[PDB]
Design an enzyme around this catalytic site. Structure first.
Site, PDB file in Angstrom:
ATOM      1  N   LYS A   1     -14.970  12.578  48.417  1.00 21.68           N
ATOM      2  CA  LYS A   1     -14.182  13.835  48.352  1.00 21.68           C
ATOM      3  C   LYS A   1     -14.800  14.931  47.492  1.00 21.68           C
ATOM      4  O   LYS A   1     -14.774  16.089  47.870  1.00 21.68           O
ATOM      5  CB  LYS A   1     -12.715  13.567  47.998  1.00 21.68           C
ATOM      6  CG  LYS A   1     -11.947  12.779  49.103  1.00 21.68           C
ATOM      7  CD  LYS A   1     -10.650  12.202  48.462  1.00 21.68           C
ATOM      8  CE  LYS A   1      -9.718  11.630  49.491  1.00 21.68           C
ATOM      9  NZ  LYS A   1      -8.416  11.286  48.841  1.00 21.68           N
TER      10      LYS A   1
ATOM     11  N   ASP B   1      -4.471  16.436  50.217  1.00 18.97           N
ATOM     12  CA  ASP B   1      -3.957  15.417  49.273  1.00 18.97           C
ATOM     13  C   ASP B   1      -2.923  16.043  48.343  1.00 18.97           C
ATOM     14  O   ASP B   1      -1.868  15.439  48.088  1.00 18.97           O
ATOM     15  CB  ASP B   1      -5.073  14.826  48.402  1.00 18.97           C
ATOM     16  CG  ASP B   1      -5.889  13.765  49.111  1.00 18.97           C
ATOM     17  OD1 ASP B   1      -5.396  13.236  50.082  1.00 18.97           O
ATOM     18  OD2 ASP B   1      -7.018  13.413  48.644  1.00 18.97           O
TER      19      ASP B   1
HETATM   20  O1  LIG Z   1      -6.819   5.901  54.223  1.00 15.35           O
HETATM   21  C1  LIG Z   1      -7.096   6.992  54.779  1.00 15.35           C
HETATM   22  O2  LIG Z   1      -7.478   7.103  55.963  1.00 15.35           O
HETATM   23  C2  LIG Z   1      -6.993   8.300  53.971  1.00 15.35           C
HETATM   24  C3  LIG Z   1      -6.559   8.259  52.646  1.00 15.35           C
HETATM   25  C4  LIG Z   1      -6.513   9.522  51.748  1.00 15.35           C
HETATM   26  O3  LIG Z   1      -7.628   9.464  50.822  1.00 15.35           O
HETATM   27  C5  LIG Z   1      -6.570  10.861  52.558  1.00 15.35           C
HETATM   28  O4  LIG Z   1      -6.956  11.942  51.677  1.00 15.35           O
HETATM   29  C6  LIG Z   1      -7.539  10.829  53.760  1.00 15.35           C
HETATM   30  O5  LIG Z   1      -7.354  12.014  54.504  1.00 15.35           O
HETATM   31  C7  LIG Z   1      -7.284   9.643  54.696  1.00 15.35           C
END
Ligand SMILES: O=C(O)C1=C[C@@H](O)[C@@H](O)[C@H](O)C1
Length: 263
Positions: free
Chosen positions: A69, A105
């Site tokens: 990220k 988020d």
């Molecule tokens: O487990 C997942 O696929 C995600 C978890 C988060 O970190 C979210 O920020 C991400 O968009 C998708």
């Protein structure tokens, strides 16, 4: 039937409930959207490059998970929205041949929180999640403290007005948030006796992991402290991501309805 490709880059990656809830929504809104989206999990080697991989796979949009990220924020052509203050990007959209970065988020976490009356928060961790959550909680006017093992993301949190500690602050917090990778390792993010001290005195233990009851959540459960895993957050930020992938054609609250149902 124009097809459009999506995915979630992560490492590790294949426990993701994201493709299920997104493809549910891509199937549901095909007609409004005038394309059929499809969404796949994508193992990204640590030593690869998010932007290069995105362009090469021909993606129209992606989500980005740990530990990419902060990297996503750095490599985007353009950052829009609250992302700018998060120093983290979790949503990628190809807009006008430019790779555009969003962060859903922050608001995803905001919407998952059923109560408002928390005074202060301790965040554990310093990745993209911690960063978005600190940014959101400061915004709400909480006092935010951040405790990582070592020196990571000091400047980011400092510049928000977070109190960055070296040792565990000897102090009570309403909100205790695990945003480390520890649950993944089947580990606690902190010494257990320390965490118990926070729990006996806190109002909510909050873990970003969704599905399995993590060591962190299970200890909170043992001490009778209220706890919440990352499920509700996950559904909200996905809905919000989907609004981006739809180039603002489908509002997140409509996506959220299909997503919550399917999950
Ligand atoms: O487990 C997942 O696929 C995600 C978890 C988060 O970190 C979210 O920020 C991400 O968009 C998708």
């Amino acid at each position: 039937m124009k097809l459009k490709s999506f995915g979630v880059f992560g490492n590790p990656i294949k426990h993701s409930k994201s493709p299920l809830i997104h493809n549910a929504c891509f199937l549901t809104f095909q007609k409004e959207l005038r394309f059929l989206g499809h969404y796949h999990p994508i193992l990204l080697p640590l030593e690869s490059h998010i932007k290069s991989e995105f362009l090469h796979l021909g993606l129209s949009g992606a989500n980005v998970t740990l530990p990419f990220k902060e990297r996503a924020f750095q490599v985007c052509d353009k950052i829009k929205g609250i992302a700018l203050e998060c120093g983290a990007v979790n949503t990628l959209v190809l807009e006008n041949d430019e790779l555009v970065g969003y962060n859903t988020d922050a608001l995803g976490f905001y919407l998952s929180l059923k109560q408002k009356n928390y005074q202060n928060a301790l965040i554990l961790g310093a990745g993209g999640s911690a960063k978005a959550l600190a940014c959101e909680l400061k915004k709400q006017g909480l006092q935010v403290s951040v405790l990582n093992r070592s020196s990571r993301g000091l400047d980011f949190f400092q510049r928000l007005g977070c109190d960055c500690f070296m040792e565990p602050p000897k102090s009570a917090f309403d909100l205790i948030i695990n945003a480390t990778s520890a649950s993944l390792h089947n580990e606690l993010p902190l010494n257990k006796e320390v965490l118990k001290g926070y729990f006996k005195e806190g109002k909510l233990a909050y873990d970003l992991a969704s599905g399995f009851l993590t060591p962190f959540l299970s200890l909170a459960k043992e001490l009778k402290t209220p706890f919440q895993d990352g499920k509700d957050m996950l559904i909200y930020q996905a809905a919000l991501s989907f609004e981006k992938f739809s180039a603002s054609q489908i509002p997140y609250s409509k996506a959220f309805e299909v997503m919550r149902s399917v999950f």
